[PDB]
Amino acid sequence: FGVLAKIVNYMKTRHQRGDTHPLTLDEILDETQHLDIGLKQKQWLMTEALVNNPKIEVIDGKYAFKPKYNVRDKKALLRLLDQHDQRGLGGILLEDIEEALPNSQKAVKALGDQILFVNRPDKKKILFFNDKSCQFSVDEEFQKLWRSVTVDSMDEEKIEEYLKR
Amino acid sequence: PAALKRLAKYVIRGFYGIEHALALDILIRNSCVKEEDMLELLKFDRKQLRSVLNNLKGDKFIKCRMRVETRHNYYFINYRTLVNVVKYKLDHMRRRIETDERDSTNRASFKCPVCSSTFTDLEANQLFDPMTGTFRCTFCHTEVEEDESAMPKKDARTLLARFNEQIEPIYALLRETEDVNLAY
Amino acid sequence: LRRNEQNGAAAHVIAEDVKLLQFHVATMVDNELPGLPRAMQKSGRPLK
Numbered sequence: 001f002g003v004l005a006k007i008v009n010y011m012k013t014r015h016q017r018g019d020t021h022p023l024t025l026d027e028i029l030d031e032t033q034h035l036d037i038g039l040k041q042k043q044w045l046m047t048e049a050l051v052n053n054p055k056i057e058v059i060d061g062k063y064a065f066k067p068k069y070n071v072r073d074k075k076a077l078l079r080l081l082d083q084h085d086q087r088g089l090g091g092i093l094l095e096d097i098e099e100a101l102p103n104s105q106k107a108v109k110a111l112g113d114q115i116l117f118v119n120r121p122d123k124k125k126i127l128f129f130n131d132k133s134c135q136f137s138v139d140e141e142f143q144k145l146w147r148s149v150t151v152d153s154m155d156e157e158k159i160e161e162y163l164k165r
Numbered sequence: 166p167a168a169l170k171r172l173a174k175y176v177i178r179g180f181y182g183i184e185h186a187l188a189l190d191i192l193i194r195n196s197c198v199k200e201e202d203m204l205e206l207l208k209f210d211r212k213q214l215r216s217v218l219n220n221l222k223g224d225k226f227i228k229c230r231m232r233v234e235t236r237h238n239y240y241f242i243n244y245r246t247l248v249n250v251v252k253y254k255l256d257h258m259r260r261r262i263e264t265d266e267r268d269s270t271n272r273a274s275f276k277c278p279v280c281s282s283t284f285t286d287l288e289a290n291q292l293f294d295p296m297t298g299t300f301r302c303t304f305c306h307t308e309v310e311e312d313e314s315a316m317p318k319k320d321a322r323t324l325l326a327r328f329n330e331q332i333e334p335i336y337a338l339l340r341e342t343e344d345v346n347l348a349y
Numbered sequence: 350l351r352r353n354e355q356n357g358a359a360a361h362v363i364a365e366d367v368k369l370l371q372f373h374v375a376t377m378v379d380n381e382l383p384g385l386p387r388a389m390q391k392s393g394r395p396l397k
């Protein structure tokens with residue numbers, strides 16, 4: 001079963017190659033220096049149990065297409081981000097590396113296009129987005145002189161506006 | 166709702182953090198997304214999302230009451246208050262800047278190079294020579310220093326006009342407000 | 350506290366800072382508060 005998780009890691013590096021093609025178990029077992037006997041049969045019982053929960057997708061026919069989000073281009077990034085922001089928002093650090101070129105040229109391809117890449121989440125997360133509408137450039141003195149508490153003065157705001165009216 | 170609140174909040178994000186701006190935009194749905202559903206969709210850290218939501222709640226933008234039931238954060242975007250909150254924020258701001266302008270016109274006006282002791286314009290009799298004409302300091306008879314800044318030579322300031330202009334988009338958006346709805 | 354408010358620091362940071370400020374002021378007024386910690390002089394001697 002551990003050798004099975006190792007095969008999963010192998011097909012993950014296979015994705016990293018980008019030459020992913022419909023395969024089967026025998027060729028992988030050969031290239032990973034392992035044999036084809038009844039041991040392969042019991043580990044294939046385990047492997048079908050895996051096919052019941054293969055978040056790393058291992059289907060029986062034409063398969064292995066793990067990434068739930070997977071396209072490969074700058075136009076691909078643009079359009080997937082577009083449709084997802086029609087859905088509204090999304091993006092994680094793992095999505096690009098699982099879907100596309102190896103974890104470089106992606107922050108680059110993001111900063112290069114009109115997309116001002118959104119890396120606003122935590123140090124290990126990049127919620128990609130392209131922002132079109134203008135965040136109103138406000139002077140920092142105006143940006144933080146705007147800080148007047150008004151934290152719980154609801155009725156007070158009502159009456160104060162009624163006063164200045 | 167209407168285009169009023171949409172454009173309003175869209176331009177209101179511009180003041181707070183852009184990390185708060187994405188969360189505000191998520192109000193695209195008024196569906197009152199729950200905190201854990203937000204973790205699924207916004208995916209910001211539970212601590213970061215908590216801080217962001219609390220900061221957005223404090224200024225009376227949104228109101229949240231998770232009931233008990235899995236618990237469901239009663240997310241919202243209270244639009245009726247939103248307009249008044251923005252109006253008061255600019256209302257106080259326009260006041261503070263004009264008061265800062267007027268309060269900046271008062272200064273001692275004089276100094277001595279040594280002894281660095283500003284006096285006042287009123288001290289002219291003490292700080293003067295019947296003969297030499299040059300104003301001389303009291304405990305050091307060696308002053309020549311007039312005014313470090315002469316006066317408001319410029320008009321009121323480029324600061325007040327700069328607020329007027331940089332906020333013309335906000336003024337225009339509140340003109341688009343135009344009280345579309347007379348409801349509570 | 351002034352710098353935290355200037356920077357717009359975390360609300361909980363400002364709350365704890367205000368709590369400590371209140372503690373310091375109340376302790377300066379009276380160091381014998383009921384059921385509250387005593388402010389030492391870095392040597393175990395309570396301040397007067």
Ligand SMILES: [Zn+2]
Nearest residue numbers: 277280302305
């Ligand atoms: Zn002098």
